[PDB]
Design a binder for this molecule. Structure first.
Ligand code: NAG
Ligand code: NA
Ligand code: NA
Ligand code: NA
Length: 235
């Protein structure tokens, strides 16, 4: 449908934008940061979704949509209000009416969430390493996310040519066997000559690209990547 076409075309607008890590991590209070010229895999998806959700004929409306995507119920309240874990990010979008969990309906396979990476490794995050308060807030979030079943598509069940229930513009969250982490990477689904490719911010290519191999191959090539969750904008 048109929503998917628009998600895809807005993602295509980001081709060649440089990959830069940690663009949201300035010192000081957590505030809404907009850096559309330097992205990572998650900020790319957030900007594309925010733009596509914003009716087009507004900087203020774009920012408001970005805020509702990036923060728990759209309320900015410190580092831990940012939806760092993609399971939580998905739940926020489902609860607040702007995402559908497509794998939730279409894939019979499920995995029990076990989320704890950030509190387990606080040295890796500036806003945790010296903030026992933030670490405690993250542990509470982690414990509430963990133990829930979610649906996913195991990577062996994803063909090169995709599946008919995965559509152009869908948001792809790549599941991972890293202990304590649910999702490792994200991008936007793009069928090119019937192959299901990914539009994504690639750290290796140092920019936003159309994948050279199908999503199925991307998954095969990383032993830690176990499958995908498929989400869809609801507008
Ligand atoms: C668990 C984790 O590391 N989540 C980070 C999140 O903190 C960050 O806001 C986002 C955009 O940079 O990238 C995610 O990977
Ligand atoms: Na699993
Ligand atoms: Na994991
Ligand atoms: Na073909």
């Amino acid at each position: 449908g048109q929503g998917g076409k628009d998600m895809l075309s807005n993602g295509i607008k980001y081709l060649d934008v440089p990959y830069v890590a940690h663009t949201l991590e300035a010192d000081g209070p957590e505030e809404l940061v907009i850096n559309c010229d330097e992205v990572d895999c998650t900020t790319l998806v957030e900007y594309v979704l925010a733009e596509t959700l914003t009716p087009k004929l507004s900087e203020s409306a774009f920012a408001d949509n970005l805020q509702k995507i990036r923060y728990r119920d759209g309320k900015i309240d410190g580092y831990t209000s940012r939806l760092h874990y993609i399971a939580d990010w998905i739940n926020n979008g489902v609860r607040n009416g702007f995402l559908q969990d497509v794998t939730g309906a279409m894939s019979p396979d499920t995995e029990r969430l076990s989320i704890s990476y950030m509190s387990s490794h606080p040295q890796l995050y500036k806003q945790l390493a010296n903030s026992p308060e933030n670490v405690a807030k993250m542990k509470k979030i982690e414990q509430s996310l963990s133990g829930k079943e979610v649906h996913y598509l195991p990577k062996a069940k994803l063909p090169a040519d995709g599946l008919p229930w995965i559509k152009d513009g869908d948001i792809i969250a790549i599941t991972t066997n890293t202990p304590g982490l649910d999702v490792a990477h994200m991008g936007i689904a793009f069928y090119a000559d019937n192959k299901l490719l990914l539009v994504h911010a690639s750290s290796t290519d140092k920019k936003v690209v159309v994948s050279k191999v199908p999503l199925s191959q991307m998954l095969k090539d990383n032993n830690k990547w176990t499958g995908i969750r498929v989400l869809r904008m609801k507008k």
